Amino acid sequence: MLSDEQMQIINSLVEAHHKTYDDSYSDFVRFRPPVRRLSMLPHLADLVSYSIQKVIGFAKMIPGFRDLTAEDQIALLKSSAIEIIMLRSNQSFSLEDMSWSCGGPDFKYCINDVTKAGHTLELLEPLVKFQVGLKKLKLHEEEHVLLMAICLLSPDRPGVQDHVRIEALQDRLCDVLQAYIRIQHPGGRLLYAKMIQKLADLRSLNEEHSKQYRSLSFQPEHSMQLTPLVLEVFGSEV
Amino acid sequence: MLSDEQMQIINSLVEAHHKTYDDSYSDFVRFRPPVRRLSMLPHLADLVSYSIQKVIGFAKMIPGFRDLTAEDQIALLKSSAIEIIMLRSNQSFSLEDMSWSCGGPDFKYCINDVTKAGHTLELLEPLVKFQVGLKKLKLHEEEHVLLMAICLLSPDRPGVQDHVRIEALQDRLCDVLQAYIRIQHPGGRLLYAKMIQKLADLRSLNEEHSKQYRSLSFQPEHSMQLTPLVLEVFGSEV
């Protein structure tokens, strides 16, 4: 059974996610329109930039994150941002289309659209298989948000300084999650292990994305289509 | 009467301008849509960024510009870009609307729309009076493009090194223009002087724009809505 502290944590994370993920996707009309070389890069650059702002807002409402130093908050966000985006995008991903469907055909992104932003199948194949397997877990939203917070508060990121403080915060969330699955998720005997494996998959997806983002960013013709926030977050500055 | 060299220069500049100014404005649909705080900043940031690329392309086709060092080409473009944009925008400006009309109501920019990108009347009043007076000159396109090239190839810009080379290039274009008005523009007795005064007006408009761009760029909430190219060109790096 769960304590008032653990339960309060779940409440905070679910509300944080509801405040930063808009199921209507009505903001997407403000992005540079999609075009279907690298015709989708402007639209998807804006999608990712908009999503980074949402992840920042989600992180700020995680219990304990704000209390970290600004330098640690930045270190965590720069390393984990692309992983949180991949996690949170599962909510729009659809198994019947194998695509991310964001309320309208114009904002339906298939594998081919993402190739039109410079990405090769070395990234898109594992990314799509990741989305499929994550969708098959049929996570409760409580588990979905705990997993995003656990990913965000990982102390084994480059640049982190207060490793001990961040590890304690992450351990607390891991205990909330393990408990929650035990009491509230029937048939969830092996779910915690499968979710942790998903965190390992994200590390590998992060590595491949960083290779392919490096290609894009070294060609000014393409890096100029990115946004200032994307260049800053995905950039290598310390 | 004009020589084959002077005449060849006019041919090159008119073709350069035709290659870099698209009267259909069909590319504007690719910008972040207009929204009517600072709701117009995303759309107008994209408009200006797109226009900087066109001015770069125009500059590259000016006789002698490519032969300058890269450092001088950059110095000239960084100082003059906003002036060339103000000049070239007169082609969409309309005296009956006192607005820039770019082929459709969505791409019709009035004074109020520009205030929604952070600008005060200290800039918009002189800018609009500048457009009005420039439109009243009823320049031939030959004169319009010569004036853009003369503005671009001004040696009295900060950062210029080969002052002598750029001044000679500008003197040649000034002689082409003065001759052209004498032979081809009836009633153009005082036109050369009025155009040169417009170059002086642009310096003052440049100064005011730089003040107000500095306000925008010092607030990351707003600078993040700019594009990488705008930040680089309007930025203060040397």
């Binding site: 920042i56 600004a70 930045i74 966000l77 800053e232 | 993040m224």
Partner: peptide
Amino acid sequence: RHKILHRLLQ
């Protein structure tokens, strides 16, 4: 020096 991130982190 991460100007946007600092501002957004408040």
